[PDB]
Design an enzyme around this catalytic site. Structure first.
Site, PDB file in Angstrom:
ATOM      1  N   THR A 260       0.842  -1.182  -0.092  1.00 44.10           N
ATOM      2  CA  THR A 260      -0.004   0.035  -0.048  1.00 44.10           C
ATOM      3  C   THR A 260       0.806   1.264  -0.101  1.00 44.10           C
ATOM      4  O   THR A 260       0.601   2.251  -0.488  1.00 44.10           O
ATOM      5  CB  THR A 260      -0.839   0.020   1.248  1.00 44.10           C
ATOM      6  OG1 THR A 260      -1.868  -1.170   0.999  1.00 44.10           O
ATOM      7  CG2 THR A 260      -1.769   1.180   1.258  1.00 44.10           C
TER       8      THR A 260
ATOM      9  N   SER B  15      -7.112  -1.022  -6.732  1.00 47.88           N
ATOM     10  CA  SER B  15      -6.684  -1.155  -5.136  1.00 47.88           C
ATOM     11  C   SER B  15      -5.181  -1.267  -5.476  1.00 47.88           C
ATOM     12  O   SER B  15      -4.562  -1.333  -6.437  1.00 47.88           O
ATOM     13  CB  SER B  15      -7.124  -2.546  -4.659  1.00 47.88           C
ATOM     14  OG  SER B  15      -6.844  -2.736  -3.237  1.00 47.88           O
ATOM     15  N   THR B  16      -4.458  -1.217  -4.308  1.00 46.48           N
ATOM     16  CA  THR B  16      -3.118  -1.833  -4.223  1.00 46.48           C
ATOM     17  C   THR B  16      -3.151  -3.114  -4.482  1.00 46.48           C
ATOM     18  O   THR B  16      -2.004  -3.517  -5.175  1.00 46.48           O
ATOM     19  CB  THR B  16      -2.466  -1.591  -2.566  1.00 46.48           C
ATOM     20  OG1 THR B  16      -2.448  -0.341  -2.240  1.00 46.48           O
ATOM     21  CG2 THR B  16      -1.115  -2.394  -2.308  1.00 46.48           C
ATOM     22  N   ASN B  17      -4.086  -3.707  -4.342  1.00 45.82           N
ATOM     23  CA  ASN B  17      -4.001  -5.340  -4.617  1.00 45.82           C
ATOM     24  C   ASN B  17      -4.003  -5.891  -5.911  1.00 45.82           C
ATOM     25  O   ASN B  17      -4.192  -7.127  -6.351  1.00 45.82           O
ATOM     26  CB  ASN B  17      -5.044  -6.082  -3.542  1.00 45.82           C
ATOM     27  CG  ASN B  17      -4.564  -5.385  -2.024  1.00 45.82           C
ATOM     28  OD1 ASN B  17      -3.798  -5.116  -1.596  1.00 45.82           O
ATOM     29  ND2 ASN B  17      -5.979  -5.698  -1.258  1.00 45.82           N
TER      30      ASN B  17
ATOM     31  N   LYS C 185      51.847 -17.634  -4.783  1.00 47.16           N
ATOM     32  CA  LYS C 185      50.441 -18.139  -4.739  1.00 47.16           C
ATOM     33  C   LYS C 185      49.436 -17.265  -5.500  1.00 47.16           C
ATOM     34  O   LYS C 185      49.401 -15.943  -5.150  1.00 47.16           O
ATOM     35  CB  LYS C 185      50.022 -18.340  -3.439  1.00 47.16           C
ATOM     36  CG  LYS C 185      48.714 -19.461  -3.067  1.00 47.16           C
ATOM     37  CD  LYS C 185      48.530 -19.913  -1.544  1.00 47.16           C
ATOM     38  CE  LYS C 185      47.562 -20.980  -1.452  1.00 47.16           C
ATOM     39  NZ  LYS C 185      46.292 -20.554  -1.479  1.00 47.16           N
TER      40      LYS C 185
ATOM     41  N   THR D  34      34.649 -39.512 -13.063  1.00 48.37           N
ATOM     42  CA  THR D  34      33.481 -39.679 -12.393  1.00 48.37           C
ATOM     43  C   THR D  34      33.852 -40.035 -11.087  1.00 48.37           C
ATOM     44  O   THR D  34      34.544 -41.158 -10.752  1.00 48.37           O
ATOM     45  CB  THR D  34      32.493 -40.497 -12.895  1.00 48.37           C
ATOM     46  OG1 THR D  34      33.336 -41.986 -13.111  1.00 48.37           O
ATOM     47  CG2 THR D  34      32.062 -40.150 -14.443  1.00 48.37           C
TER      48      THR D  34
ATOM     49  N   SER E 297      48.032 -14.368  -1.602  1.00 48.19           N
ATOM     50  CA  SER E 297      48.423 -14.724  -0.011  1.00 48.19           C
ATOM     51  C   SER E 297      49.107 -13.576   0.530  1.00 48.19           C
ATOM     52  O   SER E 297      50.232 -12.847  -0.270  1.00 48.19           O
ATOM     53  CB  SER E 297      49.113 -16.081   0.064  1.00 48.19           C
ATOM     54  OG  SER E 297      49.416 -16.118   1.332  1.00 48.19           O
ATOM     55  N   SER E 298      48.881 -13.071   1.616  1.00 45.51           N
ATOM     56  CA  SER E 298      49.742 -12.099   2.355  1.00 45.51           C
ATOM     57  C   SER E 298      51.091 -12.705   3.035  1.00 45.51           C
ATOM     58  O   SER E 298      52.021 -12.011   3.303  1.00 45.51           O
ATOM     59  CB  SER E 298      48.976 -11.566   3.569  1.00 45.51           C
ATOM     60  OG  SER E 298      48.662 -12.699   4.624  1.00 45.51           O
TER      61      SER E 298
HETATM   62  O1  LIG Z   1      46.337 -14.475   2.435  1.00 46.33           O
HETATM   63  C1  LIG Z   1      46.831 -15.157   3.168  1.00 46.33           C
HETATM   64  O2  LIG Z   1      47.737 -15.269   3.997  1.00 46.33           O
HETATM   65  C2  LIG Z   1      46.568 -16.427   2.672  1.00 46.33           C
HETATM   66  C3  LIG Z   1      46.011 -16.968   1.513  1.00 46.33           C
HETATM   67  C4  LIG Z   1      45.952 -18.286   0.926  1.00 46.33           C
HETATM   68  O3  LIG Z   1      45.401 -19.139   1.858  1.00 46.33           O
HETATM   69  O4  LIG Z   1      45.746 -18.378  -0.192  1.00 46.33           O
HETATM   70  O1  LIG Z   2      31.164 -43.555 -13.487  1.00 51.82           O
HETATM   71  C1  LIG Z   2      31.386 -44.719 -12.532  1.00 51.82           C
HETATM   72  O2  LIG Z   2      32.197 -44.836 -11.710  1.00 51.82           O
HETATM   73  C2  LIG Z   2      30.542 -45.703 -12.925  1.00 51.82           C
HETATM   74  C3  LIG Z   2      29.861 -46.046 -14.001  1.00 51.82           C
HETATM   75  C4  LIG Z   2      29.008 -47.356 -14.288  1.00 51.82           C
HETATM   76  O3  LIG Z   2      28.901 -48.137 -13.380  1.00 51.82           O
HETATM   77  O4  LIG Z   2      28.823 -47.751 -15.482  1.00 51.82           O
HETATM   78  O1  LIG Z   3      -5.948  -4.980   1.619  1.00 52.56           O
HETATM   79  C1  LIG Z   3      -5.703  -3.799   1.897  1.00 52.56           C
HETATM   80  O2  LIG Z   3      -5.568  -3.516   3.418  1.00 52.56           O
HETATM   81  C2  LIG Z   3      -5.226  -2.543   1.297  1.00 52.56           C
HETATM   82  C3  LIG Z   3      -5.691  -2.421   0.024  1.00 52.56           C
HETATM   83  C4  LIG Z   3      -5.218  -1.181  -0.794  1.00 52.56           C
HETATM   84  O3  LIG Z   3      -4.253  -0.549  -0.187  1.00 52.56           O
HETATM   85  O4  LIG Z   3      -6.015  -0.833  -1.686  1.00 52.56           O
END
Ligand SMILES: O=C(O)/C=C/C(=O)O
Ligand SMILES: O=C(O)/C=C/C(=O)O
Ligand SMILES: O=C(O)/C=C/C(=O)O
Ligand SMILES: O=C(O)/C=C/C(=O)O
Ligand SMILES: [Cl-]
Ligand SMILES: [Cl-]
Ligand SMILES: [Cl-]
Ligand SMILES: [Cl-]
Ligand SMILES: [Cl-]
Ligand SMILES: [Cl-]
Ligand SMILES: [Cl-]
Ligand SMILES: [Cl-]
Ligand SMILES: [Cl-]
Ligand SMILES: [Cl-]
Ligand SMILES: [Cl-]
Ligand SMILES: [Cl-]
Lengths: 466, 466, 466, 466
Positions: free
Chosen positions: D101, D140-142, D324, D187, D318-319
């Site tokens: 509303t 209406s709002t509604n 890294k 997989t 990394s700091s």
């Molecule tokens: O910013 C760090 O000290 C660590 C970063 C990370 O774990 O790669």
């Molecule tokens: O993706 C798997 O390791 C299995 C496949 C399957 O059972 O054919």
């Molecule tokens: O359902 C209400 O109370 C509000 C309706 C409206 O603002 O028109």
């Protein structure tokens, strides 16, 4: 002949002639055909109801409200149920309407009919022992039922923690097996700095050990109970001494340290303990899932993965790929953890649906918590027995990753500074030359000092400067 | 004696001598003891596996890759399973590791052993019909298993929509029964403007009718299948014509209009159809829950509530409060809806956990969807039969709410303006006088015109001014 | 001109000439343009980073690893930030990649450049005060950043509990205002037994008061911190005495009783404290939402609702319906509670996504918790000031509901038994005759006894039998 | 002086003298101080309100209910808002009570006051153009508010799909770059069979391409609108021809093909379209998150990971760890996806909270959907521009994984059978000898055939037998 006719507020209904339950239980059997999960499958829940009814009867007797003989026979019937008898007489769906009334009345009817038999009467002769006037005396569903839930969940939590402790011990034993396996830590899946697999597996044990206190402290919230609230918390139809005396009797009978909520009007619609206990299970499931994700990643291989560890081979991996073996035990644990997380959302909706003086959604809330407890116990036992106990490491593969890493250059920061270590790290990546050779190449440190600094065994703990 | 010895990649293992499953199914039985929900409990899922295996064998035969006699006997074995036989031979947990391999191999072993009997051989004599080389020829779990899931869920959706349509018709019939019950609409739980219960109950029917197309269009997404993907989507070991021919044969055998995904590498790790179908069930469950919340509210009473409607009285409401009767049928439906919402979160976690060429979390995802379908069918049948069909209204209570309301002043806005209507409304609230009397006191309209505009039957539709 | 050139591992980059942040912060500004929520909007978070850096510098100096003069100027810079200065120099998105490194390096760069100014140098002259070698000495992001989060959330919880307690006191005061308003309790939205509005509103206060201990005990888990873990928990490059001494110095500097985690390898990827704290917020939001649902229901009306209470009228209800006024303040609180629940799911996904030695999803996890804390504080203040303080009751409406109810028949059970009370209740419903009149017509009780038993003032507490 | 005084149902209130909004907007500004997200931040939402008001005025004029001059000036004011003017005059919180509303009246007040200026009158002189009697006539709002939401979300979906299409094309271009990179599929994170990185990245593109139809078909549900419902769907105060005529005029004015709901009583409390649209965003976010998890895994390294791909280096990792560099762009996308999933739960709670003839929780529902749309567009743009476009492969590393794998043994199944292939695979694993050498050692196949069968380029597609 095969039935007896009983009656209640709704009217008359046939009940199987030898059933210990009565008409109100029969209606609930008829009304709620939702799931394959019934009260008879939950012995701690049935036992808790028997504790509650025995305590209320003893208190009513002590307050002069219940005849001595009826109390004696209610107590004997409760003792039998506590001992595991007649649980098939509790056949209603765990997902049921009526906010628990159908379970409370199931307990009232079964106990009344067994007490009648002990008095030499026939089932259904309730003029000698009334489900409502005797077995339910001074009670409502709205205190007897949540008190039974809370004692049951408090007791089931003990079993959950027991299986968690066994799993923790399995990780600690395996950490000792693997304590001398130096390997590369990884953050953001990039090479970090060295660690041992003993450190990693003890960390699995120690993060799970933190869950013991979380599970226990939140399950302790269930010990605040509302016996004496009767219908809405006002204590209408209860004796002034009943709430305290019944709670004390219930603590002695159940062996759980139950205590009386200080505001019974507050307590009667209160589902907060269930929410935060389910949340503690969710937290533990999130940790267990992460650990299982780690295990599946570290076991990846055998030729195109990380291949740091070997999981016990539990079944052929593939119908098509010969020799493949998959991490099926961590996988089934992951799936259990996802079910626990979903069940926790069910609990949240049920809790938020409370209205005025009662929350009517506790059956599915309890069903979901009890399912999570059961699945988690089974997942943890499976993980321990069929995976963690038999894990081994590929020690040479792990050590060569450390010896050939660039990340060991981090140990030079206290000696040459981050800018200089970065120059060495960039050159190692660009050229493939070892960090060790490059430091000596640039004459930054003596060989004697470098041999100490870059020894992997010297990067596992804080140290004073070499 | 009571066992035979079979072998696989892992080693030798005893199998019950008369079991149609083999060593790999036995290992899965041993490995995954999580739940009380097993494949044998899901006939549409088992039937779908038999469709897939029959179609693959027929295609392998047509391409010259499979002997005519082996194809014939695989087909006969599949026909028996489709007809409902041997479902007890599929005993693994619906929550299992191995990403479906244990269900695929269960189908391969059962069909192979039944084909062996039809060939005059003994169970386990796989040299005459190989679970891997014949029943699984040109296949992987990673196409046979998701294709079986998708056909099963497509067929189960038909049953879900069927039960929903029965519930919709129950609302339509009840809307007709209640078409002359004029009552007060409410928005924000404040008095709004008049309506009929015919309008309100047809609106229940019509919002649920919208869910038919949502469920059906999202279930149609399951018809996109990946037969011929084999291990990861490359089609390794399949004939170039197999994917199209097998899909066409599967459409004919199953009677579902399955089509081949245009990118089998895309399709093999793809869980999106399950996510959005589960979401469509969630949307319908949210609507059903809202409707049940409405019914519990309109049934509130008998003396301190709204008391517009009467729900069939299905069991005594209270162990302590005499005469009380509670809306237990809408309550149990609410609880099922909360379970559906939680199961949908389990589906979301499982889907997000996919890695590279496969998502291994489909067992719990499928278990959760199938549980929600079953619970919803039971909830809708229960709501229809034990609540909606027998609802009655308190007609004079509803009509008097309209006649005594202030909100009917809204109908005067086109004639006197919002400011003047507000003046009337404020005076009515402050004095307790009626809108009708106050408009006549202020002489803003003739009595004859006012009698028309504020007649309850004239406040239910758009109208022309006069 | 308007820029200065800085360099890092990636290369050279322009930085605004007067910025206190440096190249790594500039990269993060460039890289993460996701939301309108930036670190500069979270003063407690910035203050906590300054606590951590001040404590680390003090400890490094106390171990002889950092020059006393450089420590002095780092400390001065930290004090200025703690006092609220330079918060505009922290401009990165609260949703950012890099696992917090961009926030740690932002603190390192700002503090280094302010220290440089205090030493008479120019911004960017890091040869005299290095962001890595001095301000980050003995540290990683992977201890400094989570330690800052934990102190910030611990301090923000204090403010959350403060506003909760003000709301609790508002409910207690209103309960006293309404202590003499007798009304009908309702369970399952059906008439139950009498209570007072004092009892109901004190129950609102008391259930919310239970949340103080839940929020506080879970926020206390944040006090377990991991300074000294450095990159992965091994303490590489830290002095053996640094972890304990830095934690002690941090407790003194911050005023929070931080303690050192017993296993820093465990602590470094550990997000469990955030999960259970967010869950405690969710529990409180679920309770708050339930209370708001109750208020909207009890305020329903004015002529077709329950109309037990009046909420302060804060804006016109409707653009079309004259005189209508809606419960807009409870409604906005409900909506905040739904946002808190959703944010809690975001936290759960972020926590479950941890991998090996680090969880990289903490920025959105922290963003979501901090958003929930802020919205909840605003919602609670709004509910108190613009609703609870000004609530009034419709005393006669409530009293007449009690006087005309059937549910008072419950009080007869101890005197006439549940069967006879049921007979009276059913006759009252069917005929409209009062329970009182029916009891006398059946000669069940004397008028003198009945007048005491059925007095609603005698149903609000337990009492001995009359 | 700096204020003017306006009047509504609640009373009189100061409004800033030059504000185009009026007293009811000011009350909403005062009442809802929850977030930093205001209507002025959402131009498509404000534009949609202007479409609605222009269409309603034109229809009212065509039906003889509105003066031509007032209609002309309402239309001009709406045109200016549509063109982007006066959006600062819409300052209410996106999280607000009153069910919309306050936004509807904000539109009524701003349009009325701009129309007054165009007529030579002053702001607040509503006797010449009434927010309720003219700008809100027949509404209406509604119906006005949900119709505005639906048009806004329909138009915002167009922009979401546009940014998704740009990301899809980025994956397609990168797939072409990587089309000759042969690598090992995996997989269950175990070695599977060969594929190309072109296949893998085209699969990313193709799974995201499937989301276009899901987003579009669910956004099309927003085109069903309820203009003419007025307060609750009965059309009270509307002309019988208004609903159809207004919907047609709205379609022409907005350019969106809106259609009239067939049951306006059904439509007025209906939130299903929002639920399933949010679910479609959730499904896409789940897919995006999975893809980003894959990218972070394949980029792991440089020396202890998989190291198949290189992501553009966007900031120092990394700091502490020199050299890294972390996958910060996929990480920030993951975090956005978690936020979208949590926002979807907020939507679900809001939808399930509807009561009777209106759902009052749409403000937070809409706020959450609009936040998710914005965050997802930013995340997809960031992933495309700062990651996907610049990915390279480590081609020799990938090729050596295939050449040294055991999984290529799968290609032998059609020639020697699964049992014989398993024997070779197990011997390769146990001895480290190559699959190729073992096949020739055991003389299972000629070298001529083996050189074809085990060629990696011959395992990427289905083939006839060599
Ligand atoms: O910013 C760090 O000290 C660590 C970063 C990370 O774990 O790669
Ligand atoms: O993706 C798997 O390791 C299995 C496949 C399957 O059972 O054919
Ligand atoms: O359902 C209400 O109370 C509000 C309706 C409206 O603002 O028109
Ligand atoms: O069964 C009872 O005692 C209470 C039921 C109710 O609250 O209706
Ligand atoms: Cl149990
Ligand atoms: Cl990462
Ligand atoms: Cl159990
Ligand atoms: Cl089935
Ligand atoms: Cl409301
Ligand atoms: Cl089913
Ligand atoms: Cl802050
Ligand atoms: Cl209810
Ligand atoms: Cl805050
Ligand atoms: Cl917008
Ligand atoms: Cl896996
Ligand atoms: Cl946007």
């Amino acid at each position: 002949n095969d039935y007896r006719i009983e009656s209640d507020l709704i009217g008359e209904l046939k009940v199987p002639v030898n059933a210990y339950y009565g008409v109100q239980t029969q209606r609930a059997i008829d009304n709620f055909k939702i799931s394959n999960d019934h009260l008879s499958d939950h012995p701690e829940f049935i036992k808790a109801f028997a504790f509650v009814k025995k305590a209320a009867a003893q208190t009513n007797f002590e307050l002069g409200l219940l005849d001595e003989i009826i109390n004696k026979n209610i107590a004997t019937a409760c003792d039998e149920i506590i001992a595991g008898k007649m649980h098939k007489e509790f056949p209603t769906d765990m997902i049921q309407g009526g906010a628990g009334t159908s379970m409370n009345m199931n307990a009232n009817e079964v106990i009344a009919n067994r007490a009648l038999e002990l008095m030499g009467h026939q089932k259904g002769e309730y003029q000698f022992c009334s489900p409502n006037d005797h077995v339910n005396l001074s009670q409502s569903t709205n205190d007897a039922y949540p008190t039974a839930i809370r004692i049951a969940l408090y007791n089931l939590n003990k079993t959950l923690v027991e299986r968690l402790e066994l799993l923790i011990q399995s990780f600690r034993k395996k950490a000792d097996d693997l304590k001398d396996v130096i390997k590369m830590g990884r953050t953001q899946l990039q090479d970090a700095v060295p660690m041992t697999m003993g450190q990693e597996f003890n960390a699995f044990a120690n993060t799970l050990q933190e869950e013991i206190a979380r599970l226990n402290t939140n399950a302790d919230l269930f010990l605040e109970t509302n016996m004496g609230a009767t219908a809405i918390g006002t204590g209408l139809n209860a004796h002034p001494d009943y709430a305290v005396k019944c709670t004390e009797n219930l603590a002695k009978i159940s062996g759980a340290d139950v205590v009386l909520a200080s505001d019974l009007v507050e307590a009667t619609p209160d589902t907060g303990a269930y929410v935060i206990y389910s949340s503690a299970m969710k937290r533990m499931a999130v940790k267990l899932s992460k650990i299982c994700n780690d295990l599946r990643l570290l076991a990846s291989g055998p030729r195109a993965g990380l291949y740091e560890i070997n999981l016990p081979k539990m079944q052929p991996g593939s119908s098509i790929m010969p020799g493949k073996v998959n991490p099926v035990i961590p996988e089934v644990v992951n799936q259990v953890c996802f079910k626990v997380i979903g069940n926790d959302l069910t609990v949240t909706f049920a809790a938020e649906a409370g209205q005025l003086q009662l929350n009517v959604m506790e059956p599915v809330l309890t069903q979901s918590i009890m399912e999570s407890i059961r699945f988690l116990k089974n997942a943890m036992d499976t993980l321990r027995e069929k995976c963690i106990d038999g894990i081994t490491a590929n020690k040479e593969i792990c050590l060569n990753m450390v010896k050939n890493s660039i990340g060991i250059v981090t140990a030079l920061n206290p000696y040459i500074g981050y800018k200089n270590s970065t120059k060495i790290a960039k050159e190692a990546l660009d050229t493939g030359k070892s960090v060790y050779d490059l430091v000596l190449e640039h004459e930054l440190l003596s060989k004697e000092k470098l041999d100490e600094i870059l020894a992997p065994e010297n990067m596992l703990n804080p140290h004073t400067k070499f």
